[model samples]
Target: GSVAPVETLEVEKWFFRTISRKDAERQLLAPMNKAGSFLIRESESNKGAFSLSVKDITTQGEVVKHYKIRSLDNGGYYISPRITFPTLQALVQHYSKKGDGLCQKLTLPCVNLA
Candidate 1:
């Protein structure tokens, strides 16, 4: 009788590297301004809705991720991924050792979004 090979589930983690507006522009290998970011929508009470929609450079086909590229002026944007999804454990562990402080937030990807 032949024995069947046991299958094991593999885990992967996707991340975004937080970079400043200056870095984003510089990353483009050109000089860009804050207003270069696109406005997605508007809000009547809180002024307006705007964001920086950046395409993931790592992923093939250029996946899209929204970023805060407005006049924030500091603490630019974050690389956010879905948390507690069960398949990202290894990835979380990998980034944790890379000096991302990922362990603290490993359980929580973001506030109210995950």
Candidate 2:
């Protein structure tokens, strides 16, 4: 059954900074692509790795999205993590419709910056 267009544009504190077609292809081709979310915590001692806990995105008993969080060590002890695309697009679109582009405009495009 075809899922109807999502109606909300909700994005959390963490999300991927860029979106590309290649990222979409990778997700679609992966096996068991049930949508999920991940909680990424540092290895406590080794900052190189993280401990991950995945959860099903529950929507009325159905899991609609899968997501993973990455700890981007931006200054001030904050770990930046976010939901990847399709999910990101869905979120932005959803928020645009209902929340007046809040999510879409929060992070302005700074392509030249590192």
**Highest-scoring model, lDDT:** 2
Candidate 1 deviant stretches above 4 angstroms: 1-45, 69-114
Clash pairs, model 1 backbone:
none
Give the total clashing residue pairs for model 1.
0
RMSD of 2: 16.7
Candidate 1 on 1-114: residue-level lDDT in tens? 356556644321123233343443343322231212211221223332233322233435433344432222332222343322222234344434442423122222211111
lDDT of 2 by residue, 1-114 (tens): 368567756343223323332343233223433233222233445544333222233446522222232334442222222222233334433433442422122222112211
Per-prediction tally of clashes? 0, 9
Instruction: State residue 89's C-alpha deviation in candidate 2, in Å.
Output: 14
> Model 2 lDDT vs. the true structure?
0.31
Worst lDDT 10-window in candidate 2 = 105-114
lDDT of 1 at 41: 20
